[PDB]
Ligand SMILES: Nc1ncnc2c1ncn2[C@@H]1O[C@H](COP(=O)(O)OP(=O)(O)OP(O)(O)=S)[C@@H](O)[C@H]1O
C-alpha cells in the first residue's frame with residue numbers, strides 16, 4: 001500500500017530543487033571520477049536531462065510495440081525505474097539505451113509479467129547477434145539497476161487510483177451523470193504528467209485526481225463539491241487548500257514541460273557516444 | 280493477562296474507505312464487473328476488486344513530503 | 345563483506361543459509377524470480393510477525409538476503425516429542441500467526457505457502473511468517489493465478505479443484521491445517537496426490553454439497569466424489585473446547601467466501617477466552 005510504501009518513504013521528494021541537486025551531484029561526481037582517472041567532452045546536467053527525456057520516450061515506444069502486450073503497470077514501473085536510476089547516475093557512466101531495456105526487463109520480472117529472455121530480445125529491432133549482445137548487457141546491468149534502486153522494487157502507479165476515483169464518482173457524485181466521458185482526456189493528461197518529474201514529487205492518488213479534475217475542467221464541468229462534501233474536505237479547510245495547491249503545482253509542471261528537440265537530441269547523442277567511446 | 284482484539288491502526292493519509300461488507304449496500308458494486316460463477320467458487324468477489332481500487336484511490340491523498 | 349559468516353545453517357531449494365554477525369544470510373534468465381519476489385514484498389512490509397529483511401546485496405546474478413536470525417520453526421516444535429503443547433501455547437502460536445496474516449492480507453498479499461516449517465520462532469518466542477517465495481498480491485480482476493500453490497497437505501479444496509481466482513481462503517485453510525497439526529502433532533490431511541488429498545479432505549470433513557458450496561461445480565478441475573458423511577470435529581479433536589471447535593469449523597468451511605478471514609478469526613471467542621496465550625518468553629524451547 002502506498003501510505004507505508006518504500007516509494008513514499010524514500011522516493012517522494014520535496015521539490016524540483018532537490019531532484020536538480022541530486023542530478024547535479026551525480027554529474028559532478030562522474031566528472032570528478034573522470035578528471036581523477038585521466039573539457040567539452042562532458043555533458044551538462046540539462047543536456048543529461050534532455051537525453052533522459054528522449055530515452056524515456058524511447059522506452060515508451062519500446063513498451064508500446066512489445067509482444068506479448070505489456071500491461072500498463074509494467075510500463076509505469078519501468079519508467080519509474082528509469083527516472084529513479086538517473087536521479088543518482090549519469091548517462092555518461094551508463095548508457096540510457098541499455099538502462100531503459102534493463103528497466104523494462106526488471107519491471108517485467110517485478111510485476112509478474114512472465115516473459116522469457118528470447119522473446120524479450122526478439123522485440124528489439126536488431127539482427128540476432130545484436131539481440132544476444134543486448135541480452136548480455138541487460139543481464140550485466142540488472143544487478144546494478146537493483147542496487148541503484150536501493151532494492152526498492154514495488155512501484156505504485158496512478159492507474160488503480162484512477163479506476164477507484166471513477167468508481168467513487170459513479171457511486172457518490174450523481175451530478176456528473178456519466179464519469180466515463182472524463183476517461184479519455186484524463187488518460188491523456190495522465191500520460192503528459194508521466195513525462196514530468198511529478199511521479200517523483202506527488203502521490204499516485206494526487207496524480208490521478210489531478211488528471212480527473214483537469215479532464216473535467218477541460219469539459220467545462222466543475223467538481224469542487226466532490227472534494228468539499230464527498231471527500232469531506234469541509235471539515236479541514238487547510239487540507240482542501242493544500243490539495244488544491246498540489247493540483248495547481250502539478251498542472252504547472254505539465255505546462256512548463258518542454259519536449260526534446262531533434263537537432264539538440266542528435267547533437268547530445270553524438271556527445272554521449274563520444275563520451276562513452278572515450279572512456 | 281487475557282487477549283482482547285484491537286484493529287490495526289495504519290494511517291492512510293486520505294479519505295475514509297467504506298467497509299467491504301457495506302460496498303454492495305452503498306451501491307459501489309453497480310459500477311464494477313460482476314464476478315463469474317467460476318470466480319465466486321474460488322472465493323473471488325467483485326467486492327475485493329472494488330475495495331482495493333477505492334483504497335488505492337484514497338491512499339496518501341492528503342500526504343505532503 | 346560487513347557480515348562475517350559464523351555458522352552454516354542449512355541448504356535449501358533456491359538458496360543457502362548461513363548464520364552470521366546475529367542475522368541469517370540467504371545466498372540467461374538473469375536474477376532468480378523467487379529472490380526478487382521475496383525482496384520486493386518484504387521491503388514493503390513491517391510487522392512483528394513477518395520476517396524482516398534487514399539488508400540485501402550480491403554480485404553478478406548471485407544475491408544475498410539478510411534476515412533476522414530465527415532460532416527454530418513450528419515444525420520442529422510439533423515434531424519434538426519432549427515438548428508438551430498446552431492450550432495456551434497453541435493459542436499463542438495461532439494468535440501470532442493470525443496477526444501476521446491479518447497484516448499481510450490488509451496489504452493485499454497472499455502468502456500461499458503457509459505450513460509449520462515456514463513459521464519461524466526466534467529466541468524470545470516471537471513467531472514470524474517467512475519464505476515469501478510464493479507470495480503474491482491479490483484483488484486485481486485482470487491477473488491470473490495458478491492453482492499449484494501451497495504444499496499439497498495444506499492446500500485448500502478450491503485450489504485442488506483448479507481455481508484460478510481466489511482470496512484469503514487459500515491461506516486461512518492452511519492455517520486450519522496448521523491448527524490441526526498443533527492439536528494432533530501429525531499432519532492432518534497427508535495426501536500423496538491431489539486426488540488423494542481431496543479424498544482425505546472429504547472423508548474427514550464430509551463431501552460438500554451445493555448448499556455448503558454454491559458454485560463448486562463450476563471449478564475447472566471439479567470431479568464428483570462419493571458422499572462421505574465426515575467425522576464430527578469433537579471426535580477428531582477430543583480435548584478441544586467448544587470455542588476451539590467453532591474456530592476450527594470456521595477455518596475449514598468449504599465455501600471460500602464463507603471461510604473466516606484472519607480478522608474474523610482474531611475476534612472469535614476462543615482467543616478472548618480463558619486461558620490467555622502464553623507469553624513469548626515462556627513458549628516451549630526445543
Ligand atoms: N531467518 C532464518 N533464520 C534461521 N534459519 C533460516 C532463516 N531463514 C531460512 N532459514 C533456514 O533455511 C532453511 C531453508 O529454507 P528457506 O531458505 O527459508 O526457503 P527455500 O529456499 O525455499 O528452501 P525450502 O524448500 O523451503 S527448505 C529454513 O527451513 C530454515 O532452517
Ligand SMILES: [Mg+2]
Nearest residue numbers: 461462474475
Ligand atoms: Mg521453507
